[PDB]
Write a protein that binds this ligand. Structure first.
Ligand SMILES: CC(C)C[C@H](NP(=O)(O)CNC(=O)OCc1ccccc1)C(=O)NC[C@H](C)C(C)C
Ligand SMILES: [Ca+2]
Ligand SMILES: [Ca+2]
Ligand SMILES: [Ca+2]
Ligand SMILES: [Ca+2]
Ligand SMILES: [Zn+2]
Length: 316
């Protein structure tokens, strides 16, 4: 909407206070004009018709319980935009500052979040498996990264290409979580998953097997559930990414870590310059090796560590 840029204040899902960029025109809207062609947050009002209505508020204060998922979807979309722009010189998900749209309060008891081809969508959870999912910065960045993937490599959402797609979203979700630097970890969704259980998460990148996901290609899922295991086999690539960054010895294979920033550079370049819609795990390894070669040189530690990490997870 046309209006003037304003700054509201509110509380997110976890009770933390934050400022949010809004727009004033009769109401204060969750419309951040400071980033690209805007970040827009919508109320789906417990229904499944999207996007719903652009979030309107009478006083620019967002402290009601109903406001909390909107505050966090809006704010964390901004952090994710800043990560891609400042770290990778990428302007929004399409590279051309496309408007970023999110809807919260999607459906009833909805234990998921997704990119629908055009926008992000967040359930509130059922209060048992999840609380409102936009409370996780890694979740928000995971969702926006699906849009980045779709505009770039275009990885088809099934089997190995789909597990790469998933891992890319978990990798960049985690790197955004580290960028914001509030309780960062290599776990996925811990801030919104299972409020009655402390210390767990939806997935682990450092130890995928803790939540039943494979950490080696010889343990990959080969069935048809979950689009051929896209949220399961992502553990193999997540583990490789974790090893590239942090190092370790895994199934007897030692990996020298090179740190998160170089991980992000290597995987961003692989995603945007080398991967294709049908890339498989072996082709991701080749893309990562080539990306590290471009960035750091064929004889570099970075290239050697990429190879060690993929060896450690059984991907040749
Ligand atoms: C980080 C998590 C908290 C959320 C994350 N959601 P996602 O991977 O973005 C789901 N996207 C999806 O299906 O895209 C396919 C598509 C394509 C077009 C339209 C619609 C849909 C996830 O890991 N979900 C797994 C469930 C909890 C179970 C486990
Ligand atoms: Ca208000
Ligand atoms: Ca965390
Ligand atoms: Ca996390
Ligand atoms: Ca929990
Ligand atoms: Zn996903």
């Amino acid at each position: 909407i046309t209006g003037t840029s304003t700054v509201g204040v509110g509380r997110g899902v976890l009770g933390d206070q934050k400022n949010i960029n809004t727009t004033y025109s009769t109401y204060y809207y969750l419309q951040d004009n400071t980033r690209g062609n805007g970040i827009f947050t919508y109320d789906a009002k417990y229904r499944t018709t999207l996007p719903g209505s652009l979030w309107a508020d009478a006083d620019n204060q967002f402290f009601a319980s109903y406001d909390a998922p909107a505050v966090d979807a809006h704010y964390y979309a901004g952090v994710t935009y800043d990560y891609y722009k400042n770290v990778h010189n990428r302007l929004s998900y399409d590279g051309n500052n496309a408007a970023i749209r999110s809807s919260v309060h999607y459906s009833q008891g909805y234990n998921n979040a997704f990119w629908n081809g055009s926008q992000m969508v967040y359930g509130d959870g059922d209060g048992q498996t999840f609380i409102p999912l936009s409370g996780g910065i890694d979740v928000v960045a995971h969702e926006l990264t699906h849009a980045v993937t779709d505009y770039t490599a275009g990885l088809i959402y099934q089997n190995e290409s789909g597990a790469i797609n998933e891992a890319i979203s978990d990798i960049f979700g985690t790197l955004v979580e580290f960028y914001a630097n509030k309780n960062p970890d290599w776990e996925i969704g811990e801030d919104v998953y299972t409020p009655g259980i402390s210390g767990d998460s939806l997935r682990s990148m450092s130890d995928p097997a803790k939540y039943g996901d494979p950490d080696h290609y010889s343990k990959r899922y080969t069935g048809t559930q979950d689009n051929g295991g896209v949220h399961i086999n992502s553990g193999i690539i997540n583990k490789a990414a974790y090893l590239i960054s942090q190092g370790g010895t895994h199934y007897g294979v030692s990996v020298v870590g090179i740190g998160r920033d170089k991980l992000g550079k290597i995987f961003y370049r692989a995603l945007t310059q080398y991967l294709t819609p049908t890339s498989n795990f072996s082709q991701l390894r080749a893309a990562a090796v080539q990306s590290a070669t471009d960035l750091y040189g064929s004889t570099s530690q970075e290239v050697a560590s990429v190879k060690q990490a993929f060896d450690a997870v059984g991907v040749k």
